[PDB]
Amino acid sequence: NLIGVTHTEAEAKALAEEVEVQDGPDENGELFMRPGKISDYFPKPYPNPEAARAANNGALPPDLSYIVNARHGGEDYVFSLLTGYCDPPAGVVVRE
Amino acid sequence: GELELHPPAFPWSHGGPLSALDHSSVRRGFQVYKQVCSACHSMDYVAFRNLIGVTHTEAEAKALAEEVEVQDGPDENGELFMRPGKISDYFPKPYPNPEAARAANNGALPPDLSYIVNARHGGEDYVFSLLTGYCDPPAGVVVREGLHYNPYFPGQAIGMAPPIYNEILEYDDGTPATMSQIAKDVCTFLRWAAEPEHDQRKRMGLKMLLISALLTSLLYYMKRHKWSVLKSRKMAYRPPK
Amino acid sequence: EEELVDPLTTIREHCEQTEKCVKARERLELCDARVSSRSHTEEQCTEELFDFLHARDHCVAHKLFNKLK
Amino acid sequence: MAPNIRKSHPLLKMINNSLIDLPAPSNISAWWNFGSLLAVCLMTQILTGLLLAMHYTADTSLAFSSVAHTCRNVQYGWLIRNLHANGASFFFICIFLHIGRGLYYGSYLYKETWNTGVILLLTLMATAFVGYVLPWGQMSFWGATVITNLFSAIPYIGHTLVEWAWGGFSVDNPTLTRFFALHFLLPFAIAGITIIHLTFLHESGSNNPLGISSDSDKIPFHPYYSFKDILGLTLMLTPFLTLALFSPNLLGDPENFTPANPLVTPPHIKPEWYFLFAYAILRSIPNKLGGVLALAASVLILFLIPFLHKSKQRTMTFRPLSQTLFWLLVANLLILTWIGSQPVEHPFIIIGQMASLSYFTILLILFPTIGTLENKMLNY
Amino acid sequence: ALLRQAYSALFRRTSTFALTVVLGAVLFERAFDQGADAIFEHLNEGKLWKHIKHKYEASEE
Amino acid sequence: IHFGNLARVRHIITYSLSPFEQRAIPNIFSDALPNVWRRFSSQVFKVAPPFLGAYLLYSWGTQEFERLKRKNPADYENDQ
Amino acid sequence: AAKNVVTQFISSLSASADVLALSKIEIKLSDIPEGKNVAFKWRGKPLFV
Numbered sequence A: 001n002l003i004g005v006t007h008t009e010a011e012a013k014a015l016a017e018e019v020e021v022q023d024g025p026d027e028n029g030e031l032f033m034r035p036g037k038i039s040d041y042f043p044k045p046y047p048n049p050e051a052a053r054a055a056n057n058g059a060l061p062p063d064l065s066y067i068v069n070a071r072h073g074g075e076d077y078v079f080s081l082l083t084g085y086c087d088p089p090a091g092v093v094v095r096e
Numbered sequence B: 001g002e003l004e005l006h007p008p009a010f011p012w013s014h015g016g017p018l019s020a021l022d023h024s025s026v027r028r029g030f031q032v033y034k035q036v037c038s039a040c041h042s043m044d045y046v047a048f049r050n051l052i053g054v055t056h057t058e059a060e061a062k063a064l065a066e067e068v069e070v071q072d073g074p075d076e077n078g079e080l081f082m083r084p085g086k087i088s089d090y091f092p093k094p095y096p097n098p099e100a101a102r103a104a105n106n107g108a109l110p111p112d113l114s115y116i117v118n119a120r121h122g123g124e125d126y127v128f129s130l131l132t133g134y135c136d137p138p139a140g141v142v143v144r145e146g147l148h149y150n151p152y153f154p155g156q157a158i159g160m161a162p163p164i165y166n167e168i169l170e171y172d173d174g175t176p177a178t179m180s181q182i183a184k185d186v187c188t189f190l191r192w193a194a195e196p197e198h199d200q201r202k203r204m205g206l207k208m209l210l211i212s213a214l215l216t217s218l219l220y221y222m223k224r225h226k227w228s229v230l231k232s233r234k235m236a237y238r239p240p241k
Numbered sequence C: 001e002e003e004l005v006d007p008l009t010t011i012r013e014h015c016e017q018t019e020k021c022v023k024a025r026e027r028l029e030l031c032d033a034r035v036s037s038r039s040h041t042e043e044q045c046t047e048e049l050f051d052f053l054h055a056r057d058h059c060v061a062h063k064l065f066n067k068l069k
Numbered sequence D: 001m002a003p004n005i006r007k008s009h010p011l012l013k014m015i016n017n018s019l020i021d022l023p024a025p026s027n028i029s030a031w032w033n034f035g036s037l038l039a040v041c042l043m044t045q046i047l048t049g050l051l052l053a054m055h056y057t058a059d060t061s062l063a064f065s066s067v068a069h070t071c072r073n074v075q076y077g078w079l080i081r082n083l084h085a086n087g088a089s090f091f092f093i094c095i096f097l098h099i100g101r102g103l104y105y106g107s108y109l110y111k112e113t114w115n116t117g118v119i120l121l122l123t124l125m126a127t128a129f130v131g132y133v134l135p136w137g138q139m140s141f142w143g144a145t146v147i148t149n150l151f152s153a154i155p156y157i158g159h160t161l162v163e164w165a166w167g168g169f170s171v172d173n174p175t176l177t178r179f180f181a182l183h184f185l186l187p188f189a190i191a192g193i194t195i196i197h198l199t200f201l202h203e204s205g206s207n208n209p210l211g212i213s214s215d216s217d218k219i220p221f222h223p224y225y226s227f228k229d230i231l232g233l234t235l236m237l238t239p240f241l242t243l244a245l246f247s248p249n250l251l252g253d254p255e256n257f258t259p260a261n262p263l264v265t266p267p268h269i270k271p272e273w274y275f276l277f278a279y280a281i282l283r284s285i286p287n288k289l290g291g292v293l294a295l296a297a298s299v300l301i302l303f304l305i306p307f308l309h310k311s312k313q314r315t316m317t318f319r320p321l322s323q324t325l326f327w328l329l330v331a332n333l334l335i336l337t338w339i340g341s342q343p344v345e346h347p348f349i350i351i352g353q354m355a356s357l358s359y360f361t362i363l364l365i366l367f368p369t370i371g372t373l374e375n376k377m378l379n380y
Numbered sequence E: 001a002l003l004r005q006a007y008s009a010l011f012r013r014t015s016t017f018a019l020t021v022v023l024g025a026v027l028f029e030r031a032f033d034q035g036a037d038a039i040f041e042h043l044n045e046g047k048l049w050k051h052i053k054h055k056y057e058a059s060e061e
Numbered sequence F: 001i002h003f004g005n006l007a008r009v010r011h012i013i014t015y016s017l018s019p020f021e022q023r024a025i026p027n028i029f030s031d032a033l034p035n036v037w038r039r040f041s042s043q044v045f046k047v048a049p050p051f052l053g054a055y056l057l058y059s060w061g062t063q064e065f066e067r068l069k070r071k072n073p074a075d076y077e078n079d080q
Numbered sequence G: 001a002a003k004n005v006v007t008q009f010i011s012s013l014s015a016s017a018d019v020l021a022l023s024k025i026e027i028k029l030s031d032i033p034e035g036k037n038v039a040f041k042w043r044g045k046p047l048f049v
């Protein structure tokens, strides 16, 4: 998708090679590893939500594909969230 | 093209338009699969619940389904885990993917046996003869290392090892485990497994034939009745001359 | 006294000794005999064999199930 | 405006003047029942069709399993399925009788009613063709590939038409899905045209077995033909149910009980009986392009029929010669059918080419010729 | 004289007629099934689970 | 209006009786069957022939196919 | 016939063999200790006992 958009057909190939993907099975039935190709989708950082929650405290870092159109205010909103963390005002106690 | 040998036609208990499945046999047939075929053969479309009211008690089934461990999850860690089987579970695959099965059968892929009978020409008549029917090759026929001879299978070289042999297990119902007796049952089971409806469908056919015959007769009267007016009709051409 | 025998192989016998089965089982051996002796023949007694089994088994079917349960 | 309430109601005036007060010959036979049957048939397929569609999943990884689930899990699912697959046949049977009838009584002189007919058939044919792929079984798959692959015989403008039709480079999901959509659609389009069909008919009324003005003696559709029609229905519905309730798969090939696998090809690839005759003609000509044409024309030919009528009389009732030529033709189809259920080895092949060769020859030369010659024997 | 009596109380008024079919049908169903089911089963004596059930229902372990 | 414009017909009388006054399927033997035969008879020699003439070709075609599968002992008379 | 065929098709849309399977879940009252809580899974949503 990146090609013709933000990268060269070259950049992308390489860019996609920086990752290892799970393909197969092979002649033995085992799953194996291989270097990424342009026809590959951006790697998941986890294998399933139950796991992600595990490494973020119950919190589930939502897939960011459609995120902007998924929250009210889109980018205007997704911006302010990032650029905008701060200390709580009086009476506001944030759980550990 | 080439020469084949068509299986004869055994008079299966359930071969009649009005004859159901000898559930007694099926129950056994089941075991034959459960303790023999379910070693290389999958039956993905059946599940222990299906057995209830058919060949086992709701009790038998539960227990029967518990004899297995299944993979569920993920859990509150994401890992997959193990648990004992429940009726709502489908008969366990003996492998995880063909590529693997082939690996443990010499390229050969023991096909899922769910719809098998309706998947091969001659159904059970066929699937029977195959089992009860392996033998030595005739002159000129050399079988490659790894395949066994069976005239009832195209190419005569099947990758399946003769699966049954007298007393290869024991029917806890008492029936003598003679080979054919096994193949008989397993085939019968195969039919059920492939079309549970079987019975109810034939029970319907009956009802349908009865209503049908009666309602056609009735309609035929009424058709004639009304039409009489025309078929009885008489006409004359009387000009003024 | 109670020696477990597969009705199959029994009825298989009874049939092999039958007008058709015999006039076939004979047709085979004849093939086999020559085919086996010969070293350079492409011949195969498949046909003949089938002829036999086709006959044998037909017979088998007609009776084999009366014995099984 | 009017006394009763079925002639002054812009709706009942259409449920009436088309099925109750409708002027019908008094002598039409059983070969006229296929009309309504064909209809009723549709009315049913569509219904069972939906009922299934409500449980189907069009996807090369669930199509088979869904259909299977539909049978094993859905209440009366299996029943509903049978009826549909068999409804298909019942449908064709009725169509073929319907068509034969029209040929044997020159109903095709009703040009429009005829051409609409032909189209209706075409649509029905296409319709099944797609519906077959849905269960995505071996035959489902391969039948798709074999047929769709013919298109690539057209020069230039085809090698593309195909990859477009597939949505890819081979029959795959992209196809399945679009076929399902198509199978959902076409039936309706059939229902639609069927309306136009019956209209062009009501512009002249039914042709009768004798082939002479019925005006001298016509009867009201009801109860005469409404009654006849229902009896006709039962006299068919019986075997339809009889086979579909006692011998389900008698008709359907088994290779379709084996989940489609693009890697392995079935021993023999052969369609459902109602496509056999055509299959046989396709396979008679060795040359994808030619065979394609022969297939096309093998069915398209129908359109010509009207322009190939030479007898001074309409129905063959009073034309012995034509009649046997007609039955020679019918049997000529049986053969083609049979030849289609067989491989491509002698004698079949030669018998094949002949049958097809005679099929066209009859509808193109004999029929029109024996017709003329017939006329002169009447001394006309 | 059933035919008479019938044509009078039943098949006369298109109302009692219909009313008969309804009720009539009710009876038909209720008793056509029995017969059919019974016939069917008989033709399959001891093959159905309805028969071989006594062998595991409260008689094992 | 489709009942009246049809055609000009004169001097024809027709008499018919209510269904109730006449018989349901009258004279099954004296009239019915005899005609059922008549009809059958008249057509057989038109229809039947080619159908029959096909059964042959089907038979020969099929029958002969099998024959071409069995081996010809003459191919193997000098394979010593 | 009518009545039947119609019943047949109508029950067709109601729940199927499988969905009716996960329908119910039972719990043994003779394996749960005092105080401690254990949660299962029912009609998708967890169940507390």
Ligand code: HEC
Pocket (backbone or CB within 6 Å): B032, B033, B036, B037, B038, B039, B040, B041, B105, B108, B109, B110, B111, B116, B120, B127, B130, B131, B153, B157, B158, B159, B160, B161, B163, B164, B186
């Ligand atoms: C030892 C593993 C093994 C077991 C256990 C086994 N089979 Fe098979 N079976 C196979 C294999 C492998 C094949 C495939 C051979 C081939 O297709 O070349 C096969 C194929 C089949 C086929 C037929 C394939 C065809 O095309 O006709 C059927 C039917 C079948 N098995 C039935 C059974 C039955 C019945 C049982 C149990 C009573 C059974 N098998 C037990 C290994 C086994």
Ligand code: HEM
Pocket (backbone or CB within 6 Å): D031, D032, D033, D034, D035, D036, D038, D039, D042, D095, D098, D099, D102, D105, D106, D107, D108, D110, D113, D114, D115, D116, D117, D118, D119, D120, D121, D124, D190, D194, D197, D198, D201, D205, D206, D207, D208, D302
């Ligand atoms: C889509 C399905 C079709 C339906 C549901 C249908 C229905 C009908 C109906 C209701 C009639 C009136 C009664 C009768 O059958 O004689 C009719 C007549 C006719 N149909 Fe069709 N038809 C169909 C297909 C066709 C086809 C494929 C042809 C042939 C190309 C065709 C040709 C005719 C002709 C010529 C008549 C005139 C009947 C006569 O001679 O009186 N129809 N059709």
Ligand code: HEM
Pocket (backbone or CB within 6 Å): D042, D045, D046, D047, D048, D049, D050, D052, D053, D054, D056, D067, D081, D084, D085, D088, D091, D124, D127, D128, D129, D131, D132, D133, D134, D135, D183, D184, D185, D186, D187, D188, D190, D252
């Ligand atoms: C023109 C009338 C119809 C014809 C001739 C027809 C024919 C068929 C055929 C040929 C099949 C293959 C059946 C098999 O597996 O043996 C089929 C399947 C199916 N049809 Fe139809 N169909 C018709 C209408 C419909 C309609 C209107 C729908 C719904 C809009 C529908 C939905 C399906 C579905 C879900 C399947 C796939 C699952 C299955 O095979 O049962 N059909 N149809």
Ligand SMILES: CO/N=C(/C(=O)OC)c1ccccc1COc1cc(C)c(I)cc1C
Pocket (backbone or CB within 6 Å): D125, D126, D128, D129, D130, D132, D133, D139, D140, D142, D143, D144, D146, D147, D269, D270, D271, D272, D275, D276, D278, D279, D280, D282, D299
């Ligand atoms: C998707 O394949 N469907 C098939 C079928 O028979 O569906 C009912 C099928 C299966 C195996 C081989 C060929 C086909 C389709 O063949 C066709 C299809 C159509 C339309 C016609 I005109 C003529 C022929 C010969």
Ligand SMILES: CCCCCCCCO[C@@H]1O[C@H](CO)[C@@H](O)[C@H](O)[C@H]1O
Pocket (backbone or CB within 6 Å): B200, B203, B204, B207, B208, B211, B212, D237, G001, G004, G005, G008
């Ligand atoms: C020509 C019209 C024939 C209609 C026949 C109606 C047959 C439907 O009969 C069905 O039989 C099943 C088996 O016992 C039952 O389980 C169903 O409830 C019943 O409706």
Ligand SMILES: [Zn+2]
Pocket (backbone or CB within 6 Å): B121, D253, D254, D255, D268
């Ligand atoms: Zn096949």
